[PDB]
Amino acid sequence: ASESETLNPSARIMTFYPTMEEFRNFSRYIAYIESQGAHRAGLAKVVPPKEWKPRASYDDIDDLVIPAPIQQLVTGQSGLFTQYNIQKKAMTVREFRKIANSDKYCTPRYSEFEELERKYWKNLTFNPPIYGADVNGTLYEKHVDEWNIGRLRTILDLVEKESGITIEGVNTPYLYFGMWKTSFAWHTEDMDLYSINYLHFGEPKSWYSVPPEHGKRLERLAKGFFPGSAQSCEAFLRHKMTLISPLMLKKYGIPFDKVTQEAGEFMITFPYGYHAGFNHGFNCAESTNFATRRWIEYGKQAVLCSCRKDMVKISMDVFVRKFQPERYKLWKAGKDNTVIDHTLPTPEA
Ligand SMILES: [Fe+2]
Ligand SMILES: [Zn+2]
């Protein structure tokens, strides 16, 4: 009964409301969140203190360019789907919001979320929406020094500092313009990093997540339903094309939790935390990945996509050598047999 029982084996999604004081130091608050067990659910929500905002107004923006809008074509039945991404073409934000609101792409009448969620799972294969995803850029004003996705100051910076290597969306910020029914397939971050997502404005974004302690179970299930993909790639889920309904997870005993994120709220994914979801309507989110000392081990063991030749791969060398000098030799010689304890928070006894 070692002190793992923080987010007692309920590993549920937790919500936090930090003080402007606690809020100032990013890396510190993540450590606090983990001491409260929030990482056990794979996903956590953080509401910024009232007197905080990254930008004055988003009135000056409909001119921003979405260089690679994506139409999401979904195929499948009864809980299991595969999403193909048809890349449309150059588009301005003004053109997007108009389509996003056009009565044939807009959200429909719904009482409770429970109902909006049902309409989503019943109609996701109809009316292929468009998602203004992976747009390089930020909406934070240069002076915002708290939780600025553009410069979080975490050790993920070592990658940049050590080799000058830049990785869009990972090492850099991304903007996501949503629309109803636009969704993100089940996945963990590249190299099993952490991710931070801020919903600048618009309709909500709902999230589903599986506790990292049960991530392996989700993979076994995924492999079983798509044996074809599982054989061609060691980590086919990283392709971000697999959708699985909450009802299917329920049916096969895979533990998970739900949460809806609203404008002005932060979402944090944790190492090896599988997540997925969908946007309610016209949206705008920003995200990037970040690391922590606790992440290093996950990074060393992350199973990567073996079929695409332009998929993200970060050299762990600088991390092991810098934060695990005693194990560098062991590791560098394919020996280090460290088992990960998903409950344990960064600091160790
Ligand atoms: Fe993600
Ligand atoms: Zn692959």
CSV table of N, CA and C in Angstrom, one decimal, residues 60 103 158 184 208 211 219 232 263 292:
chain,number,residue,atom,x,y,z
A,60,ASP,N,-8.8,40.3,-34.1
A,60,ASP,CA,-7.9,40.4,-35.2
A,60,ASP,C,-7.3,39.1,-35.5
A,103,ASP,N,-25.2,26.2,-41.6
A,103,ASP,CA,-26.2,25.2,-41.0
A,103,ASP,C,-26.0,23.8,-41.3
A,158,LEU,N,16.1,20.6,-24.0
A,158,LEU,CA,17.4,20.1,-24.3
A,158,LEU,C,17.6,19.6,-25.7
A,184,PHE,N,-10.1,13.7,-32.7
A,184,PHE,CA,-8.7,13.3,-32.7
A,184,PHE,C,-8.8,11.8,-32.2
A,208,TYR,N,-11.6,11.9,-23.9
A,208,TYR,CA,-11.7,10.5,-23.3
A,208,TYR,C,-10.3,10.2,-23.0
A,211,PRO,N,-6.2,5.4,-18.3
A,211,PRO,CA,-5.0,5.5,-17.4
A,211,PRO,C,-3.8,4.8,-18.0
A,219,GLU,N,-4.1,-1.2,-26.1
A,219,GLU,CA,-3.4,-1.6,-27.3
A,219,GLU,C,-3.7,-3.1,-27.7
A,232,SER,N,1.5,-4.5,-39.8
A,232,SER,CA,2.3,-3.6,-40.6
A,232,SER,C,3.0,-2.5,-39.8
A,263,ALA,N,-13.6,26.8,-23.3
A,263,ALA,CA,-12.8,28.0,-23.6
A,263,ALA,C,-12.2,28.5,-22.4
A,292,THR,N,9.4,16.2,-18.6
A,292,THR,CA,9.6,16.2,-17.1
A,292,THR,C,10.6,15.1,-16.9
